[PDB]
Design a protein around this ligand. Structure first.
Ligand SMILES: Cc1cc2nc3c(=O)[nH]c(=O)nc-3n(C[C@H](O)[C@H](O)[C@H](O)COP(=O)(O)O)c2cc1C
Ligand SMILES: Cc1cc2nc3c(=O)[nH]c(=O)nc-3n(C[C@H](O)[C@H](O)[C@H](O)COP(=O)(O)O)c2cc1C
Ligand SMILES: Cc1ncc(COP(=O)(O)O)c(C=O)c1O
Ligand SMILES: Cc1ncc(COP(=O)(O)O)c(C=O)c1O
Lengths: 199, 199
């Protein structure tokens, strides 16, 4: 029907929750899937999809291997962008913010909630490094599955997470004639300034 | 069934064509949709989806408004990343490269191939700038529809395109236990060096 300023909530998370809710409702594949962009030391941007696992006023959270390329890039430049590719629903949500590491307590809690095969898998991969063959991953997996016996499957020291703060959140919704609705929520010291952007 | 090095084509575009072909075949919404990431002068990355309109060994092409944020950002830093969010097919294609402007000749050709309402729309929006109301877009549209009479609908001077070169192309395909297949094709002076990357 359209997206009019007068219908927007004060808090952008409120609109995001609604859009996330309807996305699950429409059964999109991986509704929590978002593309996270980071930048290396030479100014080159990099992208990969990760899953949003939690969000609130403090920011959006995802977990990853601390030795990965994104991790290395975030340590040198914490500025990141997140984009939810919801175009089958004629929508997009883009977030601008800084990524900060989650504490051990937060990570252990989420880690032990994952399927065991995934916990073991976490142990297996030296994420982003070049490896000579797939078999390396497969032998290790087997090796560890039995090594643990699974007693509790330990939290790898190289496993962690990041929380991306909400400095800016942009909502995009398809419009005919290429005239789409775009609203940019921008942090103004606790409060949110809203502007419609030309498509 | 999996992705083994021995089954990879010498030229990454060959694998990309296959993946693009099957994506259309599976009727994904907007198979040519890709997330393009650019970086501003402060090192902050930005993202938005655009449509791939052509590709070959020289790079991947998309069209946009030359006064937009992405355009401004590319003029200051031509390094960009493209990511095709094909996860409903358990796949991802990420491209690293430099964006260069297309010539007038190339742009006119593609511009006049678009639906008239879209050509008029192109004229309407001062893409990315803040506008006070949606009505501004709607009045202009109407105004121009009749102004042209459509005799040929002129190419806006602020409309253009970019070609992103292929410096690196990464292929990702879902794997069980979180052990996914990842291969990175990297330009080595005309030739392509291939490495499997840990997931
Ligand atoms: C649907 C989907 C969800 C994914 N979720 C995550 C995630 O939550 N954490 C993660 O580290 N990688 C995840 N990945 C794999 C990443 O895209 C990427 O390959 C990996 O994190 C390494 O990226 P990097 O080399 O840029 O560091 C996911 C991939 C897909 C397609
Ligand atoms: C499926 C889809 C396809 C799109 N294709 C394009 C495109 O080809 N060119 C373009 O300028 N914007 C396109 N857009 C709109 C962009 O995502 C974005 O809103 C716009 O280019 C302005 O981005 P910027 O402010 O970062 O410059 C598309 C959006 C969607 C959801
Ligand atoms: C490398 C990697 N880590 C984590 C995840 C997902 O997080 P979780 O397994 O806790 O749901 C994925 C999902 O595809 C992944 O590919
Ligand atoms: C702003 C904008 N320009 C261009 C396009 C698509 O290119 P074209 O209309 O030539 O197919 C889109 C598609 O959503 C768009 O949103």
């Amino acid at each position: 029907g359209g997206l009019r300023r007068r219908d927007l909530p004060a808090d952008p998370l409120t609109l995001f929750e609604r859009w996330l809710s309807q996305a699950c409702e429409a059964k999109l594949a991986d509704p929590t899937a978002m593309v996270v962009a980071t930048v290396d030391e030479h100014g080159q941007p990099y992208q990969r999809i990760v899953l949003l696992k939690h969000y609130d006023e403090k920011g959006m959270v995802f977990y990853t291997n601390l030795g990965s390329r994104k991790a290395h890039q975030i340590e040198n430049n914490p500025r990141v962008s997140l984009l939810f590719p919801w175009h089958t629903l004629e929508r997009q949500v883009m977030v601008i913010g800084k990524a900060e590491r989650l504490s051990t307590l937060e990570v252990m809690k989420y880690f032990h909630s994952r399927p065991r095969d995934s916990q073991i898998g976490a142990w297996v991969s030296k994420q982003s490094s070049r490896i000579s063959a797939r078999g390396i991953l497969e032998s290790k997996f087997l090796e560890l599955k039995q090594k643990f016996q699974q007693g509790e499957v330990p939290l790898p020291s190289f496993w962690g997470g990041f929380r991306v703060s909400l400095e800016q959140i942009e909502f995009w919704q398809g419009g005919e004639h290429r005239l789409h609705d775009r609203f940019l929520y921008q942090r103004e010291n606790d409060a949110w300034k809203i502007d419609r952007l030309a498509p």
